[PDB]
């Protein structure tokens, strides 16, 4: 019993964190095999950040300008190349702690663990989700760039995010491990703002099913709804549209608890209308949207209370 925001064990990622220094800038890098991956903005000055020409800045650099430190050992850079917004530094030594890994690009609503780092040293681990506006609500200070987001289903580490910047509202933007940004963001100091954010509907439903599994049903009602009527209501509360894919994905949780997806949808509609009336659901007074259907199945018991 119980339901916590749970992160994956971070050890496999800790053994990959290194410090990358170029001129005055110091940030984090990800050392896998003989390559160190880091944000390309490590070659910029703060002035350069308005309209940087990365190709022009990179051609002026040599291998010895990049200082890479793994613990107390200085690694030797023997090559460099740019792939989208990521810099790939070829080093003379392969990481003996390299785990089994993949580079995966995730979709909004997906969750992952973040190992926040400073100076190539891990400081903390937390769980979070890719928001519908492609930003993440992280906890990052100056020096955190290059920190990575990942999942470890089975024993393979799936890298999905690398931290690049903080937007004016305090939210964070970054790329997949191939250097492609999530969202319409650029690694430029230009007028950029996160779009209006919405609630991840399929995740709130998954979390309502987790509450039923943990023995709570106060929020349920005798009603049902069509998918269309639910979406007309949900969009008035800034909730993401629920698709037939989302309904299919909630199938196993529906079969385990005995509550049809459109019946759980009717309960969500009523919660949005009435509020919680001094009650909580899994120790929360708000409707939680950072647990996917997959997260609920992984953490919760296979036997409903």
> Would you tell me which residues interact with a copy of itself (CB under 8 A)?
1-12, 14-15, 115-119, 121-128, 137-141, 143-144, 166, 170-172, 214-215, 280, 283-286, 299-305
Q: How far is the CB of 27 from ligand 860 (least distance, A)?
A: 9
Check: CB of residue 26 under 8 Å from CB of residue 145: no
Contact segment (CB under 6 A) with ligand 860 among 7-15, 118-126, 161-169, 193-201 equals 161-169
Residues near 47 by Cβ (< 8 Å), separated by ≥ 6?
Answer: none
> Interface residues for ligand 860 in 165-184 (CB under 6 A)?
165-166, 172
- In the chain, residues preceding a discontinuity (C to N beyond 2.5 A) are none
Q: How far is the CB of 215 from ligand 860 (least distance, A)?
A: 13
**Please, where are the H alpha helices in 244-286?**
244-249, 251-257, 261-274
- Which helix (H) or strand (E) segment holds residue 81: the answer is strand 77-83
> Interface residues for Cl ion in 77-116 (CB under 5 A)?
106-107, 110
292 binds Cl ion (CB under 5 A): no
Contact segment (CB under 6 A) with ligand 860 among 69-77, 153-161, 163-171, 295-303 equals 163-171
- Which helix (H) or strand (E) segment holds residue 208: the answer is helix 201-213
Active site residue 22: no
> Which one of residues 49, 67, 104, 227 is an interface residue with ligand 860 (CB under 6 A)?
49
187 binds ligand 860 (CB under 6 A): yes
Which of 1, 37, 2 has its CA nearest to residue 16? 37
Phi/psi for 298 (5° steps) reads -65, -45
- Show which residues are catalytic: 41, 145
């Amino acid at each position: 019993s119980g339901f916590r925001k749970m992160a994956f064990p971070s050890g496999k990622v800790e053994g990959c964190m290194v410090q990358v220094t170029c001129g005055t800038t110091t940030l984090n890098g990800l050392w896998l095999d003989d390559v160190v991956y880091c944000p390309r903005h490590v070659i910029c000055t703060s002035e350069d950040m308005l309209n940087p020409n990365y190709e022009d800045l990179l051609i002026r650099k040599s291998n010895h300008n990049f200082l890479v430190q793994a613990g107390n050992v200085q690694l030797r850079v023997i090559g460099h190349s740019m792939q989208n917004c990521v810099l790939k530094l070829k080093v003379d030594t392969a990481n003996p702690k390299t785990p089994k890994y993949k580079f995966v690009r995730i979709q909004p609503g997906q969750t992952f663990s973040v190992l926040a780092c400073y100076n190539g040293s891990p400081s903390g681990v937390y769980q979070c989700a890719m928001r519908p506006n492609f930003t993440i609500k992280g906890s990052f200070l100056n020096g955190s760039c290059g920190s990575v987001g990942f999942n470890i289903d089975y024993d393979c580490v799936s890298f999905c995010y690398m931290h690049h910047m903080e937007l004016p509202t305090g939210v964070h933007a970054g790329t997949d491990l191939e250097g492609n940004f999530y969202g319409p963001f650029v690694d430029r100091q230009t007028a950029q703002a996160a779009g209006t954010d919405t609630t991840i509907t399929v995740n709130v439903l998954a979390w309502l099913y987790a509450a039923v599994i943990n023995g709570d049903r106060w929020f349920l009602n005798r009603f049902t709804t069509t998918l269309n009527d639910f979406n007309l209501v949900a969009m008035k509360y800034n909730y993401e549209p629920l698709t037939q894919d989302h309904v299919d994905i909630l199938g196993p949780l529906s079969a385990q608890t005995g509550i049809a997806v459109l019946d759980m949808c009717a309960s969500l509609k009523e919660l949005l209308q009435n509020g919680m009336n001094g009650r909580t659901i899994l120790g929360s007074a708000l409707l939680e949207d950072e647990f996917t259907p997959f997260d609920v199945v992984r953490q919760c018991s296979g036997v409903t209370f």
